[PDB]
Design a protein around this ligand. Structure first.
Ligand SMILES: CCCCCCCCCCCCCCCCCC(=O)OC[C@H](COP(=O)([O-])OCC(O)COP(=O)([O-])OC[C@@H](COC(=O)CCCCCCCCCCCCCCCCC)OC(=O)CCCCCCCCCCCCCCCCC)OC(=O)CCCCCCCCCCCCCCCCC
Ligand SMILES: CCCCCCCCCCCCCCCC(=O)OC[C@H](COP(=O)(O)O)OC(=O)CCCCCCCCCCCCCCC
Ligand SMILES: CCCCCCCCCCCCO[C@@H]1O[C@H](CO)[C@@H](O[C@H]2O[C@H](CO)[C@@H](O)[C@H](O)[C@H]2O)[C@H](O)[C@H]1O
Ligand SMILES: COCCOCCOCCOc1ccc(C(C)(C)CC(C)(C)C)cc1
Lengths: 53, 68
């Protein structure tokens, strides 16, 4: 009950699905840059912080 | 003294560690990130001076009356 001409339609459907998946999964989260997350990297320096203005 | 496995933390394969969550859009909340919410007392210092004086004086008054 499934002719062989109907296969590439199914393949196209699944290609659309997996492409919709990979366009999201291709994205990734980079390194965090919030200073509040890294303030203790500077708090723990071997010298006190110079607020120079 | 100790094998390399103990030092590097793995016998054969180094397992991936799940990174720390950040909670974007707000300050980190840790045991060391609490000074953002709780600074040293700075609002009622002069009231502290006054209340210390009055506490000393009232205590001395009632203590002397009790003793006498
Ligand atoms: C002196 C030992 C510390 C000297 C240096 C360290 C230092 O002072 O750092 C600040 C240090 C802590 O910093 P802080 O946050 O300003 O503390 C609040 C003061 O204690 C809050 O008290 P206050 O100092 O602002 O005023 C209280 C007042 C009260 O005056 C009185 O009526 C006491 C009368 C005594 C006779 O006493 C005086 O100011 C001078 C009279 C002599 C005391 O304060 C002190 O230790 C000095 C006062 C301590 C007196 C009792 C000590 C036992
Ligand atoms: C009791 C509550 C502790 C008050 C500590 C004040 C604070 O915010 O904490 C700030 C202080 C450090 O003060 P400094 O940043 O000035 O060095 O201690 C800490 O950073 C963490 C204290 C953890 C213990 C909690 C109890
Ligand atoms: C020197 C004289 C002869 C005696 C020699 C033996 C002395 C032993 C006492 C020192 C022990 C130090 O113990 C030390 O513990 C830490 C735990 O933080 C282990 O740390 C290990 O495990 C942690 C997690 O638990 C891993 O993430 C890390 O990568 C790995 O190093 C060290 O591998 C070990 O060296
Ligand atoms: C005995 O010790 C008590 C321990 O419990 C501490 C209770 O903490 C609850 C604090 O509640 C808040 C919630 C929000 C805030 C805000 C976000 C409003 C503070 C702000 C604006 C300064 C960041 C402050 C306090």
């Amino acid at each position: 009950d499934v002719p062989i001409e109907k296969i590439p339609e199914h393949a196209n459907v699944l290609l659309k699905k997996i492409d919709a998946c990979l366009e999201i999964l291709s994205k990734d989260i980079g390194e965090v840059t919030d200073a509040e997350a890294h303030e203790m990297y500077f708090e723990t320096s071997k010298f006190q912080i110079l607020h120079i203005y | 003294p100790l094998p390399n496995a103990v030092v590097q933390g793995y016998t054969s394969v180094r397992g991936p560690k799940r990174p720390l969550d950040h909670f974007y859009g707000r300050t980190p909340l840790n045991i060391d990130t609490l000074w953002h919410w709780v600074k040293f007392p700075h609002r009622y210092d002069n009231l502290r001076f006054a209340v210390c004086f009055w506490a000393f004086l009232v205590s001395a008054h009632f203590a002397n009356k009790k003793q006498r």
